[PDB]
């Protein structure tokens, strides 16, 4: 199976940061990865799909890049509604695997 | 980044690169030292003027995506619309297809001086 | 069922490897930037989403196409200068024995001898200091070139300071960048880009380390064409710089000769205090922790439990021997003994002093029948520059010995062009295509 | 609009068994794949199983290969998710989620998981 | 023998030489030598723009045979199509004809702007 790590673990930013997170497979998995976003007690929703593309009604604040064995997701404005649990999953081979998850917390 | 523009489109599919067919298009024009460039310089101008003619002899001239009368022969190529156009990216394709390439440039040269013929006869009555 | 037809596609992105002649983009010097374009303020650069390309470092031909226009450049700087034809004479030399240490006994020769004027029919007896390196015995001496070739004196005008030159491709072409780090410069490189230009490069010219270069973002990279051959030479570019200090403390003083009309020659009249030889600093923690991450490095391609060895230089000419470079308009010739000295084995404020030979008869390509004359500068010169890159050979290497002995190399200068052209390549594109469509005319 | 509805969870003993059941409307649900995630407290997400349109394609992680099984019913447009011999590890938070086509700005088509339910709970405890 | 091919057609007649206008059209554009052929290519690439555009002036662009609103007169020459498309070669009709070759030109650059002009006001409405 495809090992999916997250960094960091954890972050703590300010409302108006700039906040950035990686993602890197083992194998190489085109650009077949989707960030999804989860709040406490709601299910995940999609923010990227693709690795640079941005799902529908979704803020233009949140971007989503990268290449090869490692992809990028960027938060150029952080708001309130923003704060939560980021995880990136594969989804080229089966099992998608989804990474550890990244908590962004208010400082 | 300035991820759109130009050879941006070279990743992406046939259907999505035909869109921007216009800005790789602009491009193809434009003491020691002042020599090299000149000789380089000269070069463009001929490669332009050759690509303008071949594109001028079949008969698409001014034409960024001129559609012609020749039919598609099932032997260079099996694969059908549905996986090219949106299943495959343009250099893909040239690779696959470079082999066939003048047997094309030929039909459509003999192919345009037949319509200009008809054209001929047509307006003569 | 099909019924489809052909159909023309002008401006598909498509792209062919090609060779063609690159121009100038620049911000009197012997680099001259008066023939080269000025560079645009604000270069741009498109990153191309998902695409793959192929690179190898090991044959570019804009390598070539730098050597051969730095050459003429060197070439047609030297053209509007003297030449030094009459100055092969029978010397008159002695041993000077004024205010010297003990290493510098016999480095500086006192000569006499007679010369030309502006009129043809009279004659002057002058006096000069010239370096053990350039004068050969025949109490008579000679210069070393005279035998060879009579070259020309460079011009005091012009600076040798090298200067950034961007290379920029005609119309038609285009230049792709590699900016996938960790990428060894042969392979598929996943993240590439389009430029117009490239980015500034200094045409600095060493032997044995490179300097002024440009620093690995990631950590210590070493390339190599064939690792297990040892006739390749191994390219270690490093993470972090390592400032060296080189100085030559001797007080020079000048003095100009008229040879002819309008013809001067420029001469060393005397030294004025003590007399000590130049000599270059290292700092020695730095210089350890660096060995320290390139050993690291090569472990992982010459096994993990092999003992890995630095020593000296195998030998040949001078040029290839020792660290050779300019420095403030000097030719230095320096003795890398102590830094390539020690072994590795699995398991405070000193620095490290190379003395140095400043030369004035220079054949800085390795050309034969053209060689060139330093004036000299006057005043103690000193400079600081950043060491960032070396290139290793690998001595034997039989299956024997699992003892790894690596030396200093050089000579060739392609492959100080090869360590900043690792991440380039030129191709043309291919506009016209032709493909299956569902029109009729 | 997407509507997805997760019942039958609860508290189960060790080695017992446990049927979840998730109802789907507002798509063509013959013509979408279905997706069994689970959460466990304190840890990420992990895909428990997969289903074909056509129902004849199912897939499983390790973890619960030979025990979890799941099913589709296309007429009642709903989604069934059989667990037997569950054990404290099975303890969490199952969504049913849709996986749905969609177009990169490339051009390519791929399936995520764009739909999800509002999941249920099960608890695997003596 | 290579007999037909670029300039074959020329002992023939001007109806058989007029079906084969494409292989001359094709070959129209393609230390101290090179500057005498960078000369002689400097050359070629301005009379094939000069002939491009003396055909682009009279409305003919991109064809290779485009007949025109210019009537023909009778003074310049006499022959009738029987005696001519079958019985006479091209070298033959253009040394009878080179005197007569500017006020040809000149009536159809002068024919061709009163299209324009009345395409432009038929489009005004
Ligand atoms: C790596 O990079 C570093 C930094 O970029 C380089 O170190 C620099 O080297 C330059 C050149 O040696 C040096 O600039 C000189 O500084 C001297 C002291 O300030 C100046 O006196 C000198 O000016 C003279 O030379 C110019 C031509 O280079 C002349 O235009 C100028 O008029 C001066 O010449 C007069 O004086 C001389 C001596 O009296 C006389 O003979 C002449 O006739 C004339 O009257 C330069 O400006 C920098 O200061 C160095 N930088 C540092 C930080 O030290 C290093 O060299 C690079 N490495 C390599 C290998 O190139
Ligand atoms: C980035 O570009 C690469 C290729 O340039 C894209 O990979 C391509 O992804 C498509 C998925 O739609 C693959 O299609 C597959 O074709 C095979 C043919 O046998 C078929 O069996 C599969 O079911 C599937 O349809 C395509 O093969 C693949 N390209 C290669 C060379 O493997 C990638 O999708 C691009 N990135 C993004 C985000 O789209
Ligand atoms: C090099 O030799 C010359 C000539 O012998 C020296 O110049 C002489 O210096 C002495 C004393 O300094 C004077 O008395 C002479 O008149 C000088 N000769 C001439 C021709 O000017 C010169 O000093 C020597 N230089 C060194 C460094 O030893
Ligand atoms: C400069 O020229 C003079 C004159 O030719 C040289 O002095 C002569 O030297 C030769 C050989 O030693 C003697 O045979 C002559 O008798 C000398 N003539 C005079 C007038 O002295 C002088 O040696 C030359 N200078 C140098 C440095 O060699
Ligand atoms: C790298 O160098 C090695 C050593 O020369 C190459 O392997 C040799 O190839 C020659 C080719 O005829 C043989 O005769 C030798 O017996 C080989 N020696 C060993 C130790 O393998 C190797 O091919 C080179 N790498 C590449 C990619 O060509
Ligand atoms: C290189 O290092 C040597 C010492 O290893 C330096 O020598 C000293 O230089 C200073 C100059 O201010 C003198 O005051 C000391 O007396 C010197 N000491 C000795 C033992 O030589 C030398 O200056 C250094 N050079 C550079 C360019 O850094
Ligand atoms: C090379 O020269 C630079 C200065 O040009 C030296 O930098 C000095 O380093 C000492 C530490 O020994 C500091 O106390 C000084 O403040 C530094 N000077 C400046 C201007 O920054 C450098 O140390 C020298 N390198 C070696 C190996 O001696
Ligand atoms: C590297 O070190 C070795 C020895 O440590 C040097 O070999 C010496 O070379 C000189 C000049 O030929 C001889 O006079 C000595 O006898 C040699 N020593 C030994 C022990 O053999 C060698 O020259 C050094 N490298 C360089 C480039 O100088
Ligand atoms: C470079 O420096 C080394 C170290 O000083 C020189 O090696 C010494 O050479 C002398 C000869 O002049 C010998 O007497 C010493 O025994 C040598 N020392 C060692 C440790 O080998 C070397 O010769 C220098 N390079 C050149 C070309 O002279
Ligand atoms: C030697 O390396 C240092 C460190 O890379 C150079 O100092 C940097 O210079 C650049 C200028 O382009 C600045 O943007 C960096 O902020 C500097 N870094 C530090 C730590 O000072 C230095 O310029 C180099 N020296 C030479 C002569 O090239
Ligand atoms: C000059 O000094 C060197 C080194 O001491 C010696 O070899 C040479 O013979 C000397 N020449 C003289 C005194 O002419
Ligand atoms: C010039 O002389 C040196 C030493 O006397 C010698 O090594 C060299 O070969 C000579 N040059 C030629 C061209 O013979
Ligand atoms: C390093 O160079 C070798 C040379 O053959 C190549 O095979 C390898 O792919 C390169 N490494 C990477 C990461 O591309
Ligand atoms: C070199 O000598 C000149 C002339 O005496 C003097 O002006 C200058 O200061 C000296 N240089 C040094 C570094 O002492
Ligand atoms: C080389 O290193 C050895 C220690 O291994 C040391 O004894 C010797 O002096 C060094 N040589 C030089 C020239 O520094």
């Known amino acids: 199976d495809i090992q999916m790590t997250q960094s960091p673990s954890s972050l703590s930013a300010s409302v108006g940061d700039r906040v950035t997170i990686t993602c890197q497979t083992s194998?190489?998995?085109?650009?077949?990865v989707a960030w999804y976003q989860q709040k406490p007690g709601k299910a995940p929703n999609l923010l990227i799909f693709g690795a640079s593309t941005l799902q529908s009604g979704v803020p233009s604040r949140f971007s989503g890049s990268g290449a090869g064995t490692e992809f990028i997701l960027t938060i150029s404005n952080l708001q309130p509604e923003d704060f939560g649990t980021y995880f990136c999953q594969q989804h080229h081979n089966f099992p998608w695997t989804f990474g550890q998850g990244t908590k962004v917390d208010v400082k | 980044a300035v991820f759109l523009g130009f050879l941006g489109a070279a990743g992406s599919t046939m259907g999505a690169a035909s869109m921007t067919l216009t800005v790789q298009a602009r491009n193809l024009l434009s003491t020691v030292w002042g020599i090299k460039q000149l000789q380089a310089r000269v070069l463009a101008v001929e490669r332009y003027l050759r690509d303008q003619q071949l594109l001028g002899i079949w008969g698409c001239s001014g034409k960024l995506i001129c559609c012609t009368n020749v039919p598609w022969n099932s032997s260079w190529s099996n694969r059908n619309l549905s996986e090219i156009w949106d299943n495959m990216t343009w250099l893909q394709w040239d690779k696959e297809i470079s082999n066939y390439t003048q047997i094309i440039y030929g039909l459509l040269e003999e192919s345009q001086n037949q319509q200009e013929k008809n054209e001929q006869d047509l307006l003569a009555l | 069922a099909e019924n489809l037809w052909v159909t023309v596609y002008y401006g598909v992105p498509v792209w062919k490897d090609a060779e063609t002649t690159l121009f100038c983009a620049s911000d009197h010097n012997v680099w001259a930037t008066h023939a080269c374009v000025p560079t645009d303020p604000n270069p741009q650069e498109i990153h191309l989403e998902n695409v793959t390309e192929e690179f190898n470092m090991w044959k570019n031909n804009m390598v070539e196409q730098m050597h051969t226009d730095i050459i003429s450049l060197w070439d047609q700087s030297l053209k509007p200068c003297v030449k030094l034809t009459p100055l092969c004479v029978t010397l008159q030399c002695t041993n000077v024995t004024n205010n010297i240490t003990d290493d510098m006994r016999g480095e500086l020769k006192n000569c006499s001898f007679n010369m030309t004027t502006e009129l043809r029919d009279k004659k002057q007896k002058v006096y000069s200091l010239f370096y053990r390196l350039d004068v050969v015995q025949i109490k008579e001496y000679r210069l070393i070139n005279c035998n060879t070739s009579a070259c020309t004196q460079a011009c005091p005008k012009v600076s040798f300071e090298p200067i950034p030159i961007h290379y920029c491709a005609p119309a038609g072409f285009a230049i792709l960048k590699c900016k996938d780090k960790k990428f060894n410069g042969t392979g598929p490189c996943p993240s590439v880009s389009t430029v117009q230009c490239t980015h500034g490069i200094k045409p600095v010219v060493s032997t044995q380390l490179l300097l002024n270069g440009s620093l690995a973002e990631e950590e210590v990279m070493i390339r190599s064409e064939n690792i297990t051959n040892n006739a390749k030479n191994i390219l270690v570019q490093f993470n972090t710089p390592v400032q060296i200090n080189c100085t030559r403390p001797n007080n020079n003083t000048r003095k100009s000769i008229r040879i002819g009309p309008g013809q001067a020659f420029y001469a060393t009249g005397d030294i004025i205090g003590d007399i000590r030889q130049a000599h270059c600093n290292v700092s020695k923690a730095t210089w350890n922790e660096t060995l320290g991450k390139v050993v690291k490095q090569l472990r992982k391609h010459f096994g993990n439990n092999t003992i890995i060895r630095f020593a000296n230089s195998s030998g040949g000419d001078l040029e290839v021997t020792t660290h050779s470079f300019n420095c403030g308009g000097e030719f230095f010739y320096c003795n890398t003994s102590g830094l390539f000295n020690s072994t590795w084995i699995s398991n405070s404020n000193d620095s490290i002093t190379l003395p140095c030979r400043i030369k004035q008869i220079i054949n800085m390509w390795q050309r034969i029948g053209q060689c060139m004359y330093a004036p000299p500068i006057q005043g103690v010169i000193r400079c600081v520059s950043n060491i960032t890159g070396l290139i290793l050979t690998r001595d034997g290497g039989s299956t024997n010995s699992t003892t790894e002995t690596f030396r200093p190399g050089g000579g060739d200068m392609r492959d100080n062009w090869r360590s900043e052209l690792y991440k380039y390549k030129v191709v043309k594109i291919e506009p016209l295509g032709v493909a299956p469509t569902r029109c009729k005319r | 609009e997407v509507h997805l509805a997760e019942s039958g969870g609860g508290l189960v003993q060790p080695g017992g068994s446990l049927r979840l059941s998730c109802a789907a409307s507002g798509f063509m649900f013959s013509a979408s794949e279905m997706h069994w995630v689970r959460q466990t407290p304190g840890k990420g997400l992990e895909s428990v199983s997969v289903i074909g349109g056509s129902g004849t394609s199912t897939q499983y992680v390790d973890s619960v290969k030979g025990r979890f099984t799941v099913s589709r019913d296309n007429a009642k447009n709903a989604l069934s998710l059989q667990m037997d011999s569950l054990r404290a590890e099975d303890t969490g938070v199952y969504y049913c989620?849709?996986?749905?086509?969609?177009?990169?700005?490339?051009?390519?088509?791929?399936?995520?998981?764009?739909?999800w339910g509002q999941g249920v709970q099960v608890i695997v405890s003596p | 023998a290579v007999f037909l091919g670029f300039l074959g057609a020329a002992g023939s007649t001007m109806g058989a030489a007029s079906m084969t206008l494409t292989v001359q059209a094709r070959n129209l554009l393609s230390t101290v030598w090179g500057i005498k052929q960078l000369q002689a290519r400097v050359l070629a690439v301005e009379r094939y723009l000069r002939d491009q555009q003396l055909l682009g002036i009279w409305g003919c662009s991109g064809k290779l045979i485009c007949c025109t609103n210019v009537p023909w007169n009778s003074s310049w020459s006499n022959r009738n199509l029987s005696e001519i498309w079958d019985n006479m070669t091209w070298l033959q009709w253009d040394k009878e004809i080179s005197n007569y070759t500017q006020i040809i030109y000149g009536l159809l650059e002068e024919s061709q702007n009163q299209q324009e002009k009345n395409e432009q006001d038929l489009l005004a409405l």
């Open positions: 989620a849709r996986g749905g086509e969609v177009r990169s700005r490339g051009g390519w088509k791929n399936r995520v998981l764009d739909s």
């Open positions: 194998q190489p998995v085109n650009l077949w």
